[PDB]
Amino acid sequence: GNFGPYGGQNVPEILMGALEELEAAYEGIMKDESFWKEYNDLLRDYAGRPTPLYFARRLSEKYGARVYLKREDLLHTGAHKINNAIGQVLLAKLMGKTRITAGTGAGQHGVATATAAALFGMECVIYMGEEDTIRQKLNVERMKLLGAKVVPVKSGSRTLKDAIDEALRDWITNLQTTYYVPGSVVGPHPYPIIVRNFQKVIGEETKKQIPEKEGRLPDYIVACVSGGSNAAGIFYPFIDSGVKLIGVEAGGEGLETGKHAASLLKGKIGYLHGSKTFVLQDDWGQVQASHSVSAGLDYPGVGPEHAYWRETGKVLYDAVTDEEALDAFIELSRLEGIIPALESSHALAYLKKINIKGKVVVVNLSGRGDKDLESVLNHPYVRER
């Protein structure tokens, strides 16, 4: 479970038996043809894989480049989160668990998890920070129709970090019955590997699709990063290929303002939610609140596999601001008729920061932006436009 110095299992001791049970169950399905048949059949007919690789003509004309969008927004529930949620809730069901718990920020992991729990007939309890229940209300409504209990979390910054704190408390309190589903590549081993291994289908498809468009590997692949799961999924098959892989963190009000979620760029090594990784912290080791206009990127840590990729130079990381992401959200809506998630809008915003004339660029469009419409339409910066 270590990516260089990062990762590990940094947990209360009472979780060690559950993590050993999960590691053995996961090793068992690695070679289980019937798990993969059921899972891959649901990815195809239930989620809608493979997703297309779309040539964005008007974006391409605007930037003088060949811009392709990997269309994870076309999946059932509207985001890449469903790849991981189906896989883990299937595993939970096969392990004899009867209940599912998770935390969610954008609400897309909450909806994906509730969808899979409904499909597999499991009780589902989702924790979501109170501020996120307000700015991502559409997903609260979806989870209620799917039969999940949504528990608003009123402590701390009332956003994703606090939601995960409460989901982990719930898991420990309910270990006989309950499987904890992380929605990103952050957590004690084996969870970063499990999540990345369910998301790497994105990069595997991309790798088969892009030579059909251009005859070679892309010059760049760009994906947003907070926990890191959509970017790990599209990057993993391309590590050491020579493609320029660029992960884009939330710069919030700006990297020098103290209001952002840029763990790799501005964090310090530390422990969060089971992983040794980069965490926004003060000088005394206290985890700090993150900020982002995007609820899914509003998290103060990052997956340990990205900490490792950054240190070894296998992936390059940077950030864009709330305002740059809002601009990119509006730009894709107007130019391509696709309303992107505000998370993915951080990757789209980065097209303005790379010299891409003549280049082939794949952007991971990790989800759709219907959950963000009310927040964008009311945002002061958009109001001043």
Ligand X SMILES: C=C(/N=C/c1c(COP(=O)(O)O)cnc(C)c1O)C(=O)O
Ligand Y SMILES: [O-][n+]1cccc2ccccc21
Where along the sequence are the contacts to ligand Y (CB under 6 A)?
102-103, 105, 109, 160, 164, 182-184, 186-187, 226-227, 273, 299
Q: Which of 49, 70, 81, 196 binds ligand X (CB under 6 A)?
A: 81
Least Å distance between CB 283 and K ion?
19
Stretch of residues binding ligand X (CB under 6 A), selected from 15-23, 252-260, 278-286, 341-349: 341-349
Name the β-bridge partners of 96. Answer: none
What are the backbone dihedrals phi and psi of residue 156, each rounded to the nearest 5 degrees, phi first? 60, -140
Contact of residue 230 among ligand X, K ion, its own copies, none (CB under 5-8 Å per partner type): ligand X
The CB-of-225 to K ion minimum distance in angstroms stands at 7
The SS3 of residue 342 is coil
| CA 248 to chain CA centroid, nearest Å | 12
Phi and psi (nearest 5°) for 271? -125, 135
Q: Does 107 bind ligand X (CB under 6 A)?
A: yes
Q: Which is nearer to its own copies, 84 or 290 (CB)?
A: 84
- The alpha carbon of 217 is separated from its chain's Cα centroid by a whole number of angstroms, namely 24
Please name the residue that has the structure tokens 């740059």. 324
Question: Using the rule CB under 6 A, is 124 a contact of ligand X?
Answer: no
| C-beta closer to ligand Y: residue 88 or 321 | 88
Binding residues for its own copies (CB under 8 A): 44-46, 48, 51-55, 57-58, 71, 74-76, 114-119, 121, 138, 141-142, 144-147, 330, 333-339, 369-370, 373-374, 376-377
Residue 229, interface with ligand X (CB under 6 A)?
yes
Q: Coil, helix or strand for 338?
A: coil
Closest listed residue to residue 106, CA positions, set 75, 140, 72, 76:
140
| Residue 297 binds to ligand X (criterion: CB under 6 A) | yes
Q: Is 261 in the site for K ion (CB under 5 A)?
A: yes
Q: How far apart are CA 19 and CA 255, in angstroms?
A: 36
Shortest distance in whole angstroms from residue 348 CB to K ion: 18
CA angle 320–325–330, rounded 5-degree value: 155
| Binder of residue 263, out of ligand X, its own copies, K ion, none (CB less than 5 to 8 A by kind) | K ion
Q: By CB under 6 A, is residue 104 in contact with ligand X?
A: yes
Binding region for ligand X (CB under 6 A) out of 12-20, 23-31, 101-109, 307-315:
101-109
Shortest approach of K ion to residue 302 CB, angstroms? 5
Q: Does 183 bind ligand X (CB under 6 A)?
A: yes
**CA-based radius of gyration for the chain:** 19
The yes or no reply on residue 296 touching ligand X (CB under 6 A) is yes
The amino acid present at 367, given as its one-letter code, is: G
Q: Least distance (Å) from its own copies to the CB of residue 21?
A: 26
Using CB atoms within 10 A of its CB, is residue 315 exposed (0-12), middle (13-18) or buried (19+)? buried
Measured from the CB atom, the residue of 105 and 218 that comes closer to ligand X is: 105
Spatial separation of the C-alpha atoms in residues 266 and 331, rounded to whole Å: 28
Round to whole Å and give the CA distance between 144 and 128: 13
Torsion from C-alpha of 196, 197, 202, 206, nearest 10 degrees: 110
Q: Quick check: 92 binds K ion (CB under 5 A)? A: no
Q: Which partner from the list its own copies, ligand Y, K ion, none does 261 bind, CB cut-off 5 to 8 Å by kind?
A: K ion
CA neighbours closer than 13 Å in the CB half-sphere of residue 9: 16
Q: Does 299 bind K ion (CB under 5 A)?
A: yes
Distance CA 220, CA 197 (A): 22
Residue 224 interaction partner, one of K ion, ligand X, ligand Y, none, beta carbon < 5-8 Å per kind: ligand X
Q: How far apart, in whole angstroms, are the C-alpha atoms of residue 279 and residue 288?
A: 8
DSSP character at residue 43: I
* Closest C-alpha to 339, from 71, 68, 140, 57: 71
220: contact with K ion by CB under 5 A: no
The residue range among 54-62, 106-114, 282-290, 317-325 that interacts with ligand X, by the rule CB under 6 A, is: 106-114
* Chosen residue from 108, 159, 263, 281 binding ligand X by CB under 6 A: 108
Contact status: 140 vs ligand X (CB under 6 A): no
Indicate the residue type of 9. Answer: Q
Shortest Cβ distance from residue 240 to K ion (Å)?
25
In sign, the C-alpha dihedral spanning 276, 107, 27, 22 is positive
Residues that bind ligand X (CB under 6 A): 79, 81, 104-110, 160, 183-184, 224-231, 296-297, 341, 343-344, 366-367
